[PDB]
Amino acid sequence: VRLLESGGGLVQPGGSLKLSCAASGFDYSRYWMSWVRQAPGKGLKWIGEINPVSSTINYTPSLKDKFIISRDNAKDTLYLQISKVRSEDTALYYCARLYYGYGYWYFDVWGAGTTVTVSSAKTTPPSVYPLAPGSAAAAASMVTLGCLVKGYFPEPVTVTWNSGSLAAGVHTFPAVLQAALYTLSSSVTVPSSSWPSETVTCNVAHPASSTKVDKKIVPRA
Amino acid sequence: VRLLESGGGLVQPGGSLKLSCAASGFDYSRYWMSWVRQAPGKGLKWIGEINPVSSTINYTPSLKDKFIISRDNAKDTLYLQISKVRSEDTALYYCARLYYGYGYWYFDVWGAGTTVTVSSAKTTPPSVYPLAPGSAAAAASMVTLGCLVKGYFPEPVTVTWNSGSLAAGVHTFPAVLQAALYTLSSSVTVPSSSWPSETVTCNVAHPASSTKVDKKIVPRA
Amino acid sequence: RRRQLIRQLLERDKTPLAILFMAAVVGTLVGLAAVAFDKGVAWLQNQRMGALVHTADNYPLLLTVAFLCSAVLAMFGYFLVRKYAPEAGGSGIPEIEGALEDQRPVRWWRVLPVKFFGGLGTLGGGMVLGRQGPTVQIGGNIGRMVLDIFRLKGDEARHTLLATGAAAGLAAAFNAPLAGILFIIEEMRPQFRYTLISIKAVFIGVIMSTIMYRIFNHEVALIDVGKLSDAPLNTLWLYLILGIIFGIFGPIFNKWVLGMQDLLHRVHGGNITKWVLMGGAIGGLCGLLGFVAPATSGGGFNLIPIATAGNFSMGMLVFIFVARVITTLLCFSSGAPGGIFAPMLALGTVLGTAFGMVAVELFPQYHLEAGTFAIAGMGALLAASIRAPLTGIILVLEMTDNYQLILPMIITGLGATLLAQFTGGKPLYSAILARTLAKQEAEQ
Amino acid sequence: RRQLIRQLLERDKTPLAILFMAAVVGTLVGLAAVAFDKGVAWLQNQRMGALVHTADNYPLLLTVAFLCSAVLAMFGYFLVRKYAPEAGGSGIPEIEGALEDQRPVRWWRVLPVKFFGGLGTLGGGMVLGRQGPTVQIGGNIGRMVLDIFRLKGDEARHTLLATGAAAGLAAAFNAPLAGILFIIEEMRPQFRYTLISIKAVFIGVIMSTIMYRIFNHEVALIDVGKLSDAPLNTLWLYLILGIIFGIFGPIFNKWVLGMQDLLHRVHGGNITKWVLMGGAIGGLCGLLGFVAPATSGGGFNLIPIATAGNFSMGMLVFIFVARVITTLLCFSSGAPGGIFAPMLALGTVLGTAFGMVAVELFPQYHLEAGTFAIAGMGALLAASIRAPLTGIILVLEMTDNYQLILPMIITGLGATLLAQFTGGKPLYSAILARTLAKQEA
Amino acid sequence: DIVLTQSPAIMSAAPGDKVTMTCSASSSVSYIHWYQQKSGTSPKRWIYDTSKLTSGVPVRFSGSGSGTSYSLTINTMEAEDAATYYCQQWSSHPQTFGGGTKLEILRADAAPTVSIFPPSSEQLTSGGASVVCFLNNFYPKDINVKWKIDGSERQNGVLNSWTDQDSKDSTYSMSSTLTLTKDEYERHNSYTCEATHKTSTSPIVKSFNRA
Amino acid sequence: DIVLTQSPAIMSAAPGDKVTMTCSASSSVSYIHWYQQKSGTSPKRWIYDTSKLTSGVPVRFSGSGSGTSYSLTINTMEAEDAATYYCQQWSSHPQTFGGGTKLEILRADAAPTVSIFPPSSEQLTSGGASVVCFLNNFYPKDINVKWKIDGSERQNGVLNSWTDQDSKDSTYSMSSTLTLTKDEYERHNSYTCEATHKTSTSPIVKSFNRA
């Protein structure tokens, strides 16, 4: 059973975006579907819920049609329309499946959820720079490498090494925003006798910018 | 309740073709789906039937796997695989929906059709030519137009006017075969005060050839 | 003394093969009968259209014709009764419930045709009267009719064949074989003394009839509501509250239904004509509403699926409720040949639905669906009035096929009889045989 | 007649206090049934963290999966033979009798005996239901409060006893309807009017059924989903299957009775020749319950799989036969446990098989073996225990396939109609017959 | 497997007439079915279980029969009943259909309506040159077309195709199409199309000249 | 709008320890729920109806509470219990969640490993010049980085970002990045990176010189 919701992204103030949530692995009917959003850093906030036959739909104390939840049981998909969006709407949006025990309903099965950034700023591919140890590299037992991903928008970027094939000793610091541009660095510690000698590649991807780049960490001359 | 089956076409002796039949307008489950084929000019012959959970599948007295009926209730689609085909397999293939009254089952709702022609020919698109009245057009109360569809293979072609929106006064003569090519014309009588002044378009479609063309009938300038 | 038991035990379930073979003939006959009756009832409500549409232009000409047909039919109705079998009137069950106790007679050579044609007239005209009860009676007489034609004798063959005919009837009608059997052995069956009724004989009959019905009624239901939602334990209490409500009101409705046949009795005094006339009177009044707001007229079946869905505004509901209360009383209380069984089903549904709606918003966290309470109440007025919970619950389910509601269905149907006891009230189907049995005598 | 009018106008007025008790009973029969069922499991579990524990060594399994089913089955018979020889057998005829004041409700004994006793025979995994046993535990729960509050007078005695019987058969199969219907069709004194308060019962059945739910939601006992429907031209096939169960129903009645005779020699009545032959049949089960589970255990779990048609025609007939044996050899050995549930399996399986035969014999009917499996699941409760009505309602109660209702009855009737025309008798009565005609003398 | 053989292979009767078609089985059947097939459409469930009209079938239609021999009837058939009726059984597996009966309507005379068409400019732009000539809505079906190039006979390259009786007006329509090489065509002027039908003694001519 | 407020906002305890977190309601609730949220994943239903572990939750976990105040507990918490727990109610519409509690594998001090890098040659080839300086695997999280250009303070252009407690070693890692213009950078030599953490009294320096 999977709950996969797409749609999120980048929208400029006063805009509108149709978040989608495709369900699979269970009977869509008989089920009350709902949405809950998590603002970066903050907690969760229930948005709405729509029963099977969509003969019932409730939202949290929000005005007229800030939100418009609906569902097409014919496509086992849950929808969410947000209109006249503003920064307070920038968060992670999850679609849950609703059930209950004794009867005091709970949010049964969640989904990864889509991110929605609401800004004026413009999209932007990132620049990837290799972070090789200096010339005075005290090449000890372990060698710390890493590459810098800066100047992109909006979130997020995915950094892996040698294509994931190198997952132990990896770091990816949270991106910091500055001047309508994001910036993050990825650390990857490996055995010295393992690096110069082999190939340490850092692969960054920025879906929004529709880009992918593989920076080969080579020794500082 | 629409039963629309695709897949048919042209296949060379000893070949294999997967006919498809998409259902809509009812619950696919609970339903026993079957196939019945009509050889050009001849009558109907039941091919097979496949219960809901596909835990039962029977065919007429035909050998091993000449036929292989299956169904993907996840796509509300019925399938049919014919292998090692031969001329006796050239006919119109319908997929019906099965039900019963007192219990002696009947073919409830037959779908459209799909044609399979066994031959070594070549799938040949058709050429569509507009048949406008001559310059000496004695423009009376009613005006007869029509378009000519010739040089295509194999059957069939579908001719409608203004996209069906113009159904009264229409004709489509049976195609005639000649030199391994088919040819038919479509007649459409409309009110004179209605034609030159408006747009009389004839839309021909040849599935096999995978083509569609719209010939606009214009006065002979 | 237990010296006997051991013989009885080792002797249980041995019914005279010939009593069985008859329950089959009865069943089959109660069946063909019930089918035909139902058919004709329709055929008439139809003509009452190829008469309305025929003059749809002229407005008062409709209101007029949709009054004279319901009058000319309702009249011909009361008449056949008052002048040929004053027993065909009313429900048609108390006379069988009595007859089981040899306290009333099975004049089938009269009651058969009278209750038949008589009903076609009151039902075909479209009054607020079920055709269920009337069929139960037609059934009994069907049984007793073969009993007499073959002179089978001896309590068992008399009580048995008579009882299978009653259930074969209540079954071929709602197409609920279970609800049929359960009804006899919970209501019909002589309530205060062991009886010689052969349970196994009944089944053979209920089936035989239910088949005949199917032979002429497949691919269609009476009430179709599809799988409604489920009911969580934390929402079970709401079905008790609704249960209580029907309970206090069930007896009250019992007052009105009885006390309305008194008050309606003056208006004719017993005069074959002051009655027959007041017949086409209430009769026609129906054929009228049965075109100016059909919800207040006719059987009431057709409006159930729509009440369960929630397509009636809270208002329109209360309207329909009240108006129906009236039309049903005014119609049953008027001694016209027809049951009050079916109509109570509607009555309940509607009251149920309404309770639902209130609930639905009062508690948005329960994720309710008015429709469940509509089903939890559809048999509730069969519980507070006629007081046959078990037959009532089984009938509902029998035809709404929503077994996941089974719990709320009972917690309601119980709270019902538990409050119709704690507050006066009595087996509406008994209290009738009471008055009709205490009137036989106490009058000489 | 002049009396009638008073009785009529007096109907349905049950002593409020009798009602308020039926509620306490139910609730109790409830918490009970729940706990019983739980424990039964808990044991069958341990009998695993014992099997897997030594899964390496093969004969070490077969051994341990014999000693636990022995050590438990023995401890079972014992508790009975030495403290309440009535806990043995089904547990219903003793209540059916008790309703007629022909047997006693020794609750101060039968309660703990039937409980722990069963945990031993069931937790070990013998071919015995826990249904009947619960019906009995129920009655005693009723009578226990009846005594604790000294309510007096037939009605309060017959009533509270009966509600405890149903509250029991209900909180078990989670079928409130099947429960009520059972009393008023089988338990209830068959040949004389009684003072049983129908309304009291319901309150009980519910109270128990709730308690159960409180501890058993989101799961069924038998899940088979909506099977196909059944066309009128195929209704006759359900009579043929009805007749079949009808001729065999009584025959199964012979073997079940005559097997408790033949099994009686082997111990003569000797508390130990019995207790020993106890861990004997007992252990024999725990063994098969790991070399072909289909022949052992309750038999519930294998019903869904039989309905589906996942058992080859062979494996079916095997399971049938083997079960016939294991069920007799287990019920007839006077161990504390019902033969109710296991007849359910017996029917299913026989039904399934009739299904398959049909399924091909007539390809134009578009049959689905599974329907006959359900048309038969309550057919051996109809030819043996002869309670069609309770039987049909029970199946439906838990298979939720009301579209089969017609084939269900035409089979269940053809059953008792052929079990009459051919000897046979209310298997649950014929037991109280022998145990009542043995008491005297 | 059962061999259903519908009696009249083809039959004709004038509307308002009572028509009946047979369907015999080699062995024994019960609860036969009937499907209606009008030209250009997949079959349609008409009558079933021997005599249950389907939701929509005019009460004009009636089914019947028993075991070995069945039938389907139309009390006062209408023109819109022109089609091919197929009896089918499934009272014995595997199901089987009949040979079909084609119903044809008899109506009053209804003279043609010719139309000559000069080879499209586009076709000519590829060596082809087809001179189409229609003949719409006539009755009976017996009709004779004849071409005359520059006032002369011609039968080579001519292709005719009739439609099937119309479901509504019960008339026929047939097209005649003479094909030539852009050159063969260009080297002539008069292209006449003559139609001879019962509705007239003097044929109906309809030509056009390139000039 | 029940105002659920989870007590400890953040807390740390060494595995095998008994940990308990509170969740008070402004008004009255019943049958609270709990959701576990590990970094990078959507919430997971843990406990419900006040104390029903969900199919899979280690029996290590236990729910409790009543009306006004509830709690969740871990008898001997394991390392794989590091996450954020969210209590939620829906006994009063509309449902509401708590502020959440963050559980953290309290551990033993770890000296930070400092690795400093000169700006990539490629970045310099575009006026940019970022001097990255990592600080890997340390604990507690309190750590202070400070830059020194040619042996002098500097706080302008510096950007830091800590990672969230590692799921496995329960250590923290934080990166500090000083950004400059290719020219601003080129007009200097010494670029030191000083890190001050509890694990030491004298800070950890790590520099490199362009020269």
Helix pair D107-123, D131-148: axis angle to 10 deg: 160
CB contacts of C363 in chain F (<8 Å) are 93
Task: Report the relative pairing of strands B115-118 and B9-11 from DSSP bridges.
Answer: parallel
Question: Cα separation of C282 and C216, whole Å?
Answer: 33
Interchain pair A100, C235: CB under 8 A: no
Q: How far is the C-alpha of B20 from the C-alpha of C217, rounded, in Å?
A: 36
A6-35 burial, b at 16+ Cβ within 10 Å, e below that, comes to ebbbbbeeeeebebbbbbeeeebeebbbbb
B43 close to E (CB below 8 A): yes
In Å, what resolution does this model reach? 3.1
Q: Rounded distance, CA C307 to CA C314, Å? A: 10
CB atoms within 10 A of CB E32: 30
Distance between CA B133 and CA B147 in Å, rounded? 11
D233 with B58: Cβ contact below 8 A: no
Q: Are D373 and D348 contacting, i.e. CB atoms less than 8 angstroms apart?
A: yes
Cα→Cα distances C251→A84, C418, C427, D198, Å: 58, 12, 9, 20
Degrees (nearest 5) of the Cα angle F23, F27, F33? 40
Element holding F193 (H helix, E strand): strand F190-197
Collapsing DSSP to helix, strand or coil, F208 comes out as: strand
Among A120, A151, A167, where does a domain finish? A120
Instruction: Give the span between the Cα atoms of B22 and B95, in whole angstroms.
Output: 9
- Residues F115, F135: Cα–Cα separation, whole Å: 7
- At residue A11, the 3 state secondary structure works out as strand
Nearest CA in chain B to C215: B102
| A197 and A126 in a common domain | yes
How far CA C173 is from CA of C189, C217, C221, C341, C378, in Å, comes to 20, 11, 11, 12, 17
Instruction: Provide the terminal-to-terminal Cα distance of chain A, rounded to the nearest Å.
Output: 52
Contacts of B120 (CB under 8 A, 6+ apart): B12, B13
CB–CB contact F95 C364 (8 Å): no
Bridge partners (DSSP) listed for residue F114: F135
Shortest Cα distance, chain A CAs vs residue F160, angstroms: 8
D205: which 2 tokens?
């059945």
On whether both B90 and B184 belong to a single domain, the answer is no
Query: What is the rounded CA–CA span in Å between residue A3 and residue A34?
Result: 12
**How far apart (Å, rounded) are the C-alpha atoms in residues B56 and B48?**
10
Rounded distance between C-alpha atoms, residue C123 and residue C74, angstroms:
8
How many domains are contained in chain A?
A: 2
Cis peptide before A61 (omega within 30 of 0): no
Query: Within 10 A of D345 (CB to CB), how many other CB atoms are there?
Result: 26
What's the DSSP call for residue C325?
A: H
Would you call A103 an interface residue with chain C, using a CB distance cutoff of 8 Å?
Answer: yes
Burial class (CB in 10 A: 0-12, 13-18, 19+), D16: exposed
Residue D380 makes CB contacts below 8 A (sequence gap 6+) with D245, D249, D252, D343, D344, D346, D347, D350
The answer to whether D428 is annotated as binding is yes
Q: Give Cβ neighbours of residue C207 (< 8 Å, ≥ 6 apart).
A: C27, C177, D406, D409, D410, D413
Closest chain C residue to D192 measured between Cα atoms? C194
What's the rounded Cα separation, in Å, for the pair D288 and D278? 16
Do F108-210 and F1-107 have the same topology in CATH? Answer: yes
DSSP state of D192: S
Q: Report the CATH number at residue B85.
A: 2.60.40.10
Instruction: Please tell me the distance in Å from E162's CA to the nearest CA on chain B.
Output: 6
Mark which of A120, A135, A153 sits at the end of a domain. Answer: A120
Are A2 and A97 found together in one domain? yes
Number of neighbouring beta carbons within 10 Å of residue E49: 17
| C-alpha atoms less than 13 angstroms from C-alpha of A190 in its C-beta half-sphere | 20
Residue ranges of the alpha helices (H) in chain A? Answer: none
Same structural domain for residues B41 and B102? yes
Contact D337/D315 with Cβ under 8 angstroms? no
d(CA D170, CA D27): 12
Which two tokens mark D388?
Answer: 């069609």
Task: Answer yes or no: do B10 and B39 share one domain.
Answer: yes
**CATH number for the domain running over E1-107:** 2.60.40.10
Other CB atoms within 10 A of residue F125 CB: 9
Q: Which residue of C has its CA nearest to F92?
A: C365
Q: For residues C140 and C355, is the Cβ–Cβ distance under 8 A?
A: no
**Number of domains comprising chain C:** 1
In three-state secondary structure terms, C297 is coil
Residue B66 main-chain phi, psi, to 5 deg: -50, -45
Q: Return phi, psi of residue F166, to 5°.
A: -65, 140
Kindly report the number of other CB atoms within 10 A of residue C154's CB atom: 11
What is the pairing mode between strands E143-149 and E114-117? unpaired
**At which residue do the structure tokens 């199964």 appear?**
D252
**Could you tell me the residue ranges of all domains in chain E?**
1-107, 108-210
Kindly report the CATH number assigned to the domain that includes residue C54. 1.10.3080.10
> Are A163 and A215 contained in the same domain?
yes
C-alpha distances in angstroms, A202 versus A146, A199, A216, F54, F179? Answer: 8, 10, 6, 39, 21
> SS3 of D288, please?
helix
F11 sits in which H/E element? strand F10-13
E8 in Cβ contact with E22 (< 8 Å): yes
CA pair distance A148, A131, nearest whole angstrom = 7
Å between D357 CA and nearest CA of chain C: 25
Distinct helix (H) and strand (E) counts, chain F: 2, 20
Residue C389, both tokens:
């919970």
How far separated are the first and last CA of chain C, in Å rounded? Answer: 45
Q: Tokens in use for D50? A: 């014992």
**Please, are residues B197 and B219 in contact by the beta-carbon 8 Å criterion?**
no
Distance of CA C31 to the CA centre of its chain: 17
The residue length of chain D stands at: 441
User: Cα(D438)–Cα(C344) distance, rounded to whole angstroms?
Assistant: 53
Q: State which of A91, A120, A149 marks the end of a domain.
A: A120
Choose among D149, D142, D131: nearest CA to D200. Answer: D142
∠A123-A128-A130 over CA atoms, to 5°?
165
The 3-class secondary structure across chain B, one letter per residue, is CEEEEECCEEECCCCCEEEEEEEECCCCCCCEEEEEEECCCCCEEEEEEECCCCCCEEECCCCCCCEEEEEECCCCEEEEEECCCCHHHCEEEEEEEEECCCCCCEECCCCCCCEEEECCCCCECCEEEECCCCCCCCCCCEEEEEEEEEEEECCCCEEEEHHHCCCCCEEECCCEECCCCEEEEEEEEEEHHHCCCCCEEEEEEECCCCEEEEEEECCCC
Per DSSP, which regions of F18-157 are E strands?
Answer: 19-24, 33-37, 44-45, 47-48, 52-53, 61-66, 69-74, 83-89, 96-97, 101-105, 113-116, 128-138, 143-149
Residue type, C107: R
Which H or E run contains C126? none
Distance CA F178, CA A114 (A): 32
Which contiguous run of DSSP H or E holds residue F205?
strand F204-205
CA D135, CA D340: separation in Å to the nearest integer? Answer: 11
Whether residues B49 and B103 fall in one domain: yes
Nearest to A38 by CA among A114, A99, A108, A109: A114
A1 and A107 housed in the same domain: yes
Q: Tell me which amino acid residue D416 is.
A: T
CA distances from D184 to B196, C166, C185, D159 (A): 86, 20, 9, 12
Cβ–Cβ below 8 Å for F96 and A46:
yes
- Angle formed at CA D29 by CA D26 and CA D35, multiple of 5 degrees: 135
Strands (E), chain A: 2-6, 9-11, 17-24, 32-38, 44-50, 57-59, 67-72, 77-82, 91-99, 106-109, 114-118, 127-130, 142-152, 158-161, 170-172, 176-177, 182-191, 201-206, 211-216
- Find all residues with CB under 8 Å of D61, minimum gap 6, and list them: D51, D54, D55, D290
What tokens were used for E24?
């015999």
DSSP conformational letter for F98: -
> How many angstroms separate the CA atoms of C205 and C28, rounded?
7
Tokens of F82: 């590091």
D267: its two tokens: 């111990």
- The whole-angstrom separation of Cα C338 and Cα C117 is 11
Alpha-carbon distances, residue B163 vs A8, B174, B209, B212, E115 (angstroms): 39, 20, 20, 12, 24
Contact D319, D302 (CB under 8 A): yes
Residue F25 forms beta bridges with which residues? none
Same domain, B49 and B95: yes
Q: What angle (nearest 5°) sits at the alpha carbon of residue A30, between those of residues A29 and A35?
A: 75
Looking at the structure, tell me whether residues A15 and A110 fall in a common domain: yes
Q: Give, as one character, the DSSP assignment of residue F110.
A: B
The separation between CA A210 and the C-alpha centre of its own chain, rounded to angstroms, equals 15
Q: Kindly identify which residue of chain C lies nearest to residue F96, measuring between CA atoms.
A: C365
Residues E36 and E46: their CA atoms lie apart, in Å, by 6
C143 Ramachandran zone, left/alpha/beta (phi>0; psi -120 to 50): alpha
Interface of F with C (CB under 8 A): 90-95
Domain that holds residue D108: 1-441
CA distances from B170 to E136, E173, F210 (A): 10, 11, 87
**Which residues have CB under 8 Å from C117's CB, separation 6+?**
C80
Strands A67-72 and A9-11, how do they pair?
A: unpaired
CA-based nearest distance B30→chain E, Å? 20
Buried b / exposed e over C266-278, threshold 16 CB at 10 Å, is eebeeeeeebbeb
Residue type, D264: H
Q: Copy the structure tokens of residue F179.
A: 């950004």
Q: How far is CA A65 from the centre of its chain?
A: 26
Report the alpha-carbon distance of residue D183 to residue D203 in Å, rounded.
Answer: 14
CATH superfamily of E108-210: Immunoglobulins (2.60.40.10)
* C162 contacts C133 by C-beta, under 8 angstroms: no
If you write DSSP's letter for every residue of D83-111 in order, what string do you get? T-TTSSS-SSHHHHHHHTTSS---HHHHH
Q: What angle do CA A36, A37, A42 make, to 5 degrees?
A: 130
E in contact with C (at least 3 C-beta pairs within 8 A): no
**CA C182, C183, C184: angle at the middle one, nearest 5?**
95
- Of E31, E86, E209, Cβ closest to residue B102: E31
DSSP chain E: ---EEES-SEEEE-TTS-EEEEEEESS---S-EEEEE-TTS--EEEEETTTEE-TT--TTEEEEEETTEEEEEESS--GGG-EEEEEEE-SSSSPEE---EEEEE--------EEEE---HHHHTTTEEEEEEEE-SBSSS-EEEEEEETSS---TTEEEEEPP--TTT--B-EEEEEEEEHHHHHT--EEEEEEEETT-SS-EE--EE--
Spatial distance between the Cα atoms of C56 and D6, rounded to a whole number of angstroms = 55
**CB burial class (10 A; 0-12, 13-18, 19+) of residue E60?**
middle
Decide if C129 contacts C81 (C-beta within 8 A). Answer: no
Chain F touches chain E, with at least 3 Cβ pairs below 8 Å, answer: no
Answer yes or no: do A94 and A135 share one domain. Answer: no
Query: For residue F185, how far is the Cα from the chain centroid?
Result: 32
Asked if A105 and C365 come within 8 Å (Cβ–Cβ), the reply is: yes
Q: Which chains touch E (3 or more CB pairs under 8 A)?
A: B, D
Residue B37: burial class (beta carbons within 10 Å; 0-12, 13-18, 19+): buried
F111 DSSP 8-state letter? P
Same domain, B90 and B164: no
Cis peptide before B196 (omega within 30 of 0): no
Structural domain of B19: 1-120
- Strand extents, DSSP E, C20-166: none
**Phi and psi for C90 in degrees, rounded to 5?**
50, -170
- State the Cα–Cα distance between residues D185 and D209, nearest whole angstrom: 20
In angstroms, the CA B126 to CA B209 distance is: 8
Beta-carbon-side half-sphere exposure of residue D1 (alpha carbons within 13 Å): 17
